[PDB]
Design an enzyme around this catalytic site. Structure first.
Site, mmCIF file in Angstrom:
data_model
loop_
_atom_site.group_PDB
_atom_site.id
_atom_site.type_symbol
_atom_site.label_atom_id
_atom_site.label_comp_id
_atom_site.label_asym_id
_atom_site.label_seq_id
_atom_site.Cartn_x
_atom_site.Cartn_y
_atom_site.Cartn_z
ATOM 1 N N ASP A 1 1.159 24.586 54.828
ATOM 2 C CA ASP A 1 0.855 25.228 53.562
ATOM 3 C C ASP A 1 1.607 26.558 53.485
ATOM 4 O OD1 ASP A 1 -0.393 25.388 51.074
ATOM 5 O OD2 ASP A 1 -2.431 25.632 51.866
HETATM 6 C C1 LIG Z 1 6.836 28.265 42.784
HETATM 7 C C2 LIG Z 1 5.515 28.643 42.058
HETATM 8 C C3 LIG Z 1 4.438 27.639 42.211
HETATM 9 O O1 LIG Z 1 4.222 27.575 43.594
HETATM 10 C C4 LIG Z 1 4.498 26.355 44.338
HETATM 11 O O2 LIG Z 1 5.105 25.446 43.773
HETATM 12 C C5 LIG Z 1 4.062 26.355 45.752
HETATM 13 C C6 LIG Z 1 5.316 26.471 46.570
HETATM 14 C C7 LIG Z 1 3.058 25.281 46.009
HETATM 15 O O3 LIG Z 1 3.278 24.694 47.295
HETATM 16 C C8 LIG Z 1 4.097 23.541 47.371
HETATM 17 C C9 LIG Z 1 4.585 23.342 48.745
HETATM 18 C C10 LIG Z 1 3.486 22.781 49.693
HETATM 19 C C11 LIG Z 1 4.082 22.519 50.967
HETATM 20 O O4 LIG Z 1 2.522 23.650 49.919
HETATM 21 C C12 LIG Z 1 2.779 25.027 50.448
HETATM 22 C C13 LIG Z 1 2.955 21.588 49.161
HETATM 23 O O5 LIG Z 1 1.933 21.026 49.893
HETATM 24 C C14 LIG Z 1 2.499 21.882 47.819
HETATM 25 C C15 LIG Z 1 1.962 20.675 47.074
HETATM 26 O O6 LIG Z 1 3.462 22.407 46.943
HETATM 27 C C16 LIG Z 1 1.625 25.657 45.844
HETATM 28 C C17 LIG Z 1 1.268 26.535 47.002
HETATM 29 C C18 LIG Z 1 0.692 24.594 45.625
HETATM 30 O O7 LIG Z 1 -0.492 24.750 46.334
HETATM 31 C C19 LIG Z 1 -0.900 23.807 47.416
HETATM 32 O O8 LIG Z 1 -1.213 22.573 46.838
HETATM 33 C C20 LIG Z 1 -1.702 21.751 47.802
HETATM 34 C C21 LIG Z 1 -1.897 20.458 47.093
HETATM 35 C C22 LIG Z 1 -2.870 22.243 48.513
HETATM 36 C C23 LIG Z 1 -2.478 23.454 49.191
HETATM 37 N N1 LIG Z 1 -3.558 23.938 49.956
HETATM 38 C C24 LIG Z 1 -4.721 24.529 49.304
HETATM 39 C C25 LIG Z 1 -3.965 22.999 51.049
HETATM 40 C C26 LIG Z 1 -2.037 24.356 48.196
HETATM 41 O O9 LIG Z 1 -1.664 25.584 48.771
HETATM 42 C C27 LIG Z 1 0.375 24.353 44.153
HETATM 43 C C28 LIG Z 1 -0.098 23.006 43.995
HETATM 44 O O10 LIG Z 1 1.501 24.393 43.480
HETATM 45 C C29 LIG Z 1 -0.555 25.373 43.623
HETATM 46 C C30 LIG Z 1 -0.850 25.287 42.142
HETATM 47 C C31 LIG Z 1 -1.937 26.116 41.930
HETATM 48 C C32 LIG Z 1 0.224 25.559 41.245
HETATM 49 O O11 LIG Z 1 0.528 24.577 40.514
HETATM 50 C C33 LIG Z 1 0.994 26.784 41.213
HETATM 51 C C34 LIG Z 1 0.670 27.401 39.920
HETATM 52 C C35 LIG Z 1 2.358 26.631 41.486
HETATM 53 O O12 LIG Z 1 3.011 25.855 40.529
HETATM 54 C C36 LIG Z 1 3.226 27.860 41.612
HETATM 55 C C37 LIG Z 1 2.550 28.999 42.093
HETATM 56 O O13 LIG Z 1 3.444 28.283 40.375
#
Ligand SMILES: CC[C@H]1OC(=O)[C@H](C)[C@@H](O[C@H]2C[C@@](C)(OC)[C@@H](O)[C@H](C)O2)[C@H](C)[C@@H](O[C@@H]2O[C@H](C)C[C@H](N(C)C)[C@H]2O)[C@](C)(O)C[C@@H](C)C(=O)[C@H](C)[C@@H](O)[C@]1(C)O
Ligand SMILES: Nc1nc2c(ncn2[C@@H]2O[C@H](COP(=O)(O)OP(=O)(O)O)[C@@H](O)[C@H]2O)c(=O)[nH]1
Ligand SMILES: [Ca+2]
Length: 295
Positions: free
Chosen positions: A197
């Site tokens: 994460d």
């Molecule tokens: C760029 C800007 C965007 O950031 C990302 O793309 C990053 C890089 C994601 O990680 C990316 C990369 C990665 C590896 O996580 C770090 C991956 O697992 C997720 C799906 O997407 C994040 C953090 C994700 O969280 C993760 O989602 C998981 C399903 C559970 C995890 N946790 C609670 C267990 C949690 O942190 C998730 C879904 O995007 C959070 C929701 C709230 C959003 O849609 C938000 C608004 C995002 O669009 C963002 C902030 O705008």
């Protein structure tokens, strides 16, 4: 809650400056409380939101034990107090690179997103290469998910089929996923202990934007290292992805020729994760994100 915090701390032989107690509610598994002890040291108190704390944190703690044993280039939580009622650790140095704002649907950045310091990528590359090389195999009784390279590939294949069976998946997106799964040369031939994460809210940085610590090891497992690179791509674009890959490669991280391409395809499988989380969490926002992301 404040009074409750003090009492819970007291029960675990932790004594705090009451006036410093602050709540962070952003975690879905723990309420987090920041407070100084009487020597002025900053602590984090994890108060679990759901029952069966021990079983549910066993995996994370095993990962933390490995990191605290082996890693020197970054800090990770070191749970000095660990009970069904309270997890507490000294707060890591530095601050989050950014924090998620859910209304805005993006980050509140501590760094300049238009001039990202190159030290962020250099330092994160060092951190990730160190982490991913930790010899988890030397532990006698790990309960982490552990994949060989082939198992990591089959895991993705199976996760995608399960999402397809429950949510459905648009034809072109499905076809892109399958092309990725079927391209042997794109897949890594080594796996490693990952954080799972990695994103701005969990990467602690110093004043020069060096990554000095990682919090929240809930998703730690031994699998494709690529997941720890997705944040760089999504936040900083291809340039930030390339910079991290370069730093990681040059400091000795496992590198393969199609690593960038592979990570970009993993990014195209972002909807798998959203769909999975919607199911386990029951959070309406993830359900709607999943429906739109799957096309
Ligand atoms: C760029 C800007 C965007 O950031 C990302 O793309 C990053 C890089 C994601 O990680 C990316 C990369 C990665 C590896 O996580 C770090 C991956 O697992 C997720 C799906 O997407 C994040 C953090 C994700 O969280 C993760 O989602 C998981 C399903 C559970 C995890 N946790 C609670 C267990 C949690 O942190 C998730 C879904 O995007 C959070 C929701 C709230 C959003 O849609 C938000 C608004 C995002 O669009 C963002 C902030 O705008
Ligand atoms: N700045 C800082 N914030 C922390 C630290 N530990 C926890 N937090 C914050 O508290 C939140 C919840 O704690 P976390 O362990 O992530 O819980 P979870 O998200 O429920 O699994 C984190 O996501 C951070 O926002 C720390 O050492 N430093
Ligand atoms: Ca968290």
């Amino acid at each position: 809650d404040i009074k409750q915090v003090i009492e819970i701390a007291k029960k675990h032989n932790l004594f705090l400056k009451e006036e410093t107690i602050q709540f962070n509610e952003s975690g879905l598994d723990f309420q987090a409380v920041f407070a100084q002890d009487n020597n002025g040291i900053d602590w984090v108190l994890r108060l679990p939101r759901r029952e069966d704390v021990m079983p549910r944190t066993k995996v994370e703690k095993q990962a933390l034990d490995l990191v605290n044993k082996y890693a020197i280039s970054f800090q990770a939580p070191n749970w000095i107090i660990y009970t069904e009622e309270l997890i507490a650790y000294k707060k890591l140095d530095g601050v989050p690179a950014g924090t998620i704002d859910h209304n805005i649907g993006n980050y509140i950045w501590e760094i300049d997103i238009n001039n990202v310091p190159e030290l962020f990528h250099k330092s994160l590359g060092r951190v990730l290469a160190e982490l991913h090389s930790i010899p988890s195999n030397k532990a006698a009784a790990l309960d982490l998910v552990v994949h060989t390279p082939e198992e990591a590939r089959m895991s993705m294949k199976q996760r995608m089929d399960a999402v397809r069976a429950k949510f459905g998946v648009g034809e072109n997106l499905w076809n892109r996923w399958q092309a990725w799964l079927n391209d042997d040369d794109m897949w890594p031939k080594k796996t490693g202990l990952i954080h799972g994460d990695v994103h701005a809210g969990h990467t602690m940085i110093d004043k020069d934007a060096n990554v000095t610590g990682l919090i929240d090891w809930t998703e730690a497992k031994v699998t494709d290292v690529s997941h720890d690179f997705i944040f760089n791509y999504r936040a900083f674009g291809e340039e930030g992805l390339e910079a991290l890959i370069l730093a990681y490669k040059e400091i000795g991280g496992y590198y393969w020729p199609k690593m960038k391409e592979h990570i970009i395809e993993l990014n195209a499988a972002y909807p798998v994760s959203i769909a999975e989380f919607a199911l386990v969490s029951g959070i309406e926002e993830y359900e709607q994100m999943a429906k739109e992301a799957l096309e």
